Amino acid sequence: GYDRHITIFSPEGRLYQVEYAFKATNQTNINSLAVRGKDCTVVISQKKVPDKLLDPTTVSYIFCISRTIGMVVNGPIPDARNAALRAKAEAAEFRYKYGYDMPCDVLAKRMANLSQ
Amino acid sequence: TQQPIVTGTSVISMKYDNGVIIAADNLGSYGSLLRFNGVERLIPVGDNTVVGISGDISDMQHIERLLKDLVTENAYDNPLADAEEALEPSYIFEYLATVMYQRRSKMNPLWNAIIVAGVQSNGDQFLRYVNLLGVTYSSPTLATGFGAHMANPLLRKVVDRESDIPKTTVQVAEEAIVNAMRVLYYRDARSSRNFSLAIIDKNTGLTFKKNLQVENMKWDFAKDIKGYGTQK
């Protein structure tokens, strides 16, 4: 019972709760594709606006972190904004304490460690 | 107490084989304000001595009075007085040395560094320095105030010791001085673009050139330097 709610191992040897998170991802029905150019990168994603009432401009999945870094999100949008806001803060703080722009790799590695 | 109000900056000098060169700029500065443009600080005394005085201007002019009277004094009595007993440099210097010591013993100093540059009747180079304390020393090359930390390392290269003096000619020395002024105008707050320069030779007497200007200033590199570090 209380081995599958919190993040401790199960008797088998797997973090159930983490595994349940990946099934939460495909709950928006967005698909995305991302390719490396020769000097650029391009990322397209579908943008389904359900109701006529929604204003089509505010619905977005592409977030500008810095001049250098763009970010496209797959999943539920509350957690989108929560991970995008934390990303922006780390992007600014890096620039301040080391004096150049945050590379792509270093922003990716900082998120994996908060995720852990 | 005397505190300086108006001041001038450095005086720089050096011997060579036939005489001495001595240079100093024309600026009276009153704190930040560069109040007086053109205040001549080299005063020729006779025709084989220059006395260059830096530091306070109120007192620069008060030592100009004593030095004009000393010439008038000697003139009295037999014309032999100005033919072959005329005032050597080594005299004029000893009169300012004895004046400076006495003033400081009343705790009321004449607030000046002084360089007496001349060539004696004997043929010899004479170049000595005195200041508000009364310290005296003679060297191949002499500088005052701020130029003691800057100009002097540059001129000491040319003539390092006593044996280099009969090798250095007037073409080499005149350049070495004019090159020192160039570095003082980069790296000193109280200096100006206009300086004066004197060549005392033992064959053509006193040549006094006024209002020589520093030229050939390198700023070509300056348009590339950008930001204060982290700025792109």
- Domain limits, chain B: 1-232
Cβ partners under 8 Å of residue B7, min gap 6: B28, B29, B54, B55, B56, B57, B190
List the end-to-end C-alpha distance of chain B, in Å, as a whole number. 53
A77, containing H or E segment: helix A77-98
Structure tokens at A49: 């606006």
Q: What secondary structure letter does DSSP report for A103?
A: P
Query: Is A99 at the interface with chain B, CB within 8 A?
Result: yes
Q: Chain centroid to CA B10: how far?
A: 7
Please name the residue ranges forming H helices in chain B. 57-75, 80-83, 89-104, 151-158, 170-187
Sort out which chain B residues have CB atoms less than 8 A from A100's CB and list them. Answer: 230
Q: How far is CA B125 from CA A113, B113, B138, B178, B202, in A?
A: 79, 20, 11, 21, 9
Q: Are B117 and B127 spatial neighbours (Cβ–Cβ below 8 Å)? A: yes
CA distance A44 to chain B (A): 32
Residue of A nearest to B229 (CA): A99
Residue A13 backbone class (left: φ over 0; alpha: ψ -120 to 50; beta: rest) = left
Task: Indicate which technique resolved this structure.
Answer: cryo-EM
**Which residues have a Cβ under 8 Å from the Cβ of A90 and sit 6 or more positions away?**
A102, A107, A110, A111
Rounded to the nearest angstrom, the gap between the alpha carbon of residue A80 and the centroid of all alpha carbons in its chain is 6
Side chain identity, residue A79: D
- CA nearest B230 in A: which residue? A99
In the stretch 59-78 of chain B, residues with CB closer than 8 A to chain A read none
Residue A13 forms contact with B (CB below 8 Å): no
Task: Tell me the chain A residues in contact with residue B229 when contact means C-beta distances shorter than 8 Å.
Answer: 99
The 10 Å Cβ neighbour count of residue B38 is 13
Q: Which of B1, B7, B72, B144 is catalytic?
A: B1
3-state SS, residue B50: strand
**B229 and chain A: CB distance < 8 Å anywhere?**
yes
Determine the Cα–Cα distance for residues B64 and B50; give it in Å rounded to an integer. Answer: 12
B227 part of contact set with chain A, CB < 8 Å: no
Shortest distance, CA A62 to any CA of chain B (angstroms): 27
CA dihedral B46, B47, B49, B51 (to 10 degrees): 70
Looking at the complex, report in whole angstroms how far the Cα of residue A109 sits from the nearest Cα belonging to chain B.
24
Helix (H, G, I), strand (E, B) or coil at B230: coil
3-state percent breakdown (helix, strand, coil) of chain B, nearest 5: 35, 30, 40
Residues B63, B53: contact at Cβ < 8 Å?
A: yes
Cβ–Cβ < 8 Å for B195, B214: yes
B138 Cβ contact partners less than 8 Å away, ≥ 6 residues apart: B126, B127, B128, B129
Q: Is the dihedral of CA B118, B121, B122, B123 positive or negative?
A: positive
Tokens of B122: 């004997």
Closest to A24 measured CA to CA, from A62, A78, A72, A61: A78
How far apart (Å, rounded) are the C-alpha atoms in residues B9 and B113?
A: 10
Rounded-to-integer distance, Cα B43 and Cα B45, Å: 6
Residues of B in contact with A98 (CB under 8 A): none
Under DSSP, the state recorded for A116 is: -
Residues paired with residue A62 on neighbouring β-strands, in sequence order: A72
User: Is A67 an 8 Å CB contact of chain B?
Assistant: no
Q: How far apart are the first and last CA of chain A?
A: 23
* Count of other CB atoms within 10 angstroms of residue B45: 18
Distance from CA of B219 to the nearest CA of A (A): 29
Cα–Cα distance measured from residue A74 to residue A26, given in angstroms and rounded to the nearest whole number: 8
> Which residue, B21, B210, B55, is CA-closest to B146?
B55
Q: Is B7 a catalytic residue?
A: no
CA distance B166 to B198: 20
- CA–CA dist B150, B146 (Å, integer): 7
**CATH C-level class of B1-232:** alpha beta
As a whole number of angstroms, the distance between CA B93 and CA A62 comes to 85
**Under 8 Å between Cβ of B184 and B24:** no
Distance CA B144, CA B9 (A): 8
- Determine the Cα angle at A14 with ends A11 and A17, to 5°: 105
**For residue B174, with 0-12 CB atoms within 10 Å meaning exposed, 13-18 middle and 19 or more buried, which class applies?**
middle
- Using a CB–CB cutoff of 8 Å, tell me whether B230 touches chain A: yes
**A96 at interface of B, judged by CB pairs closer than 8 A:** no
Report the length, in residues, of chain B. 232
Kindly state the tokens that stand for B218: 């390198």
Q: How far is CA A25 from the centre of its chain?
A: 10
B130 burial type by CB count under 10 A (0-12 exposed, 13-18 middle, 19+ buried): buried
Residue located via tokens 């508000």: B132
Q: Report the residue of chain A nearest B232, measured CA to CA.
A: A100
Contacts of A99 in chain B (CB under 8 A): 229-230
State which residue of chain A sits closest to B228, comparing Cα positions.
A99
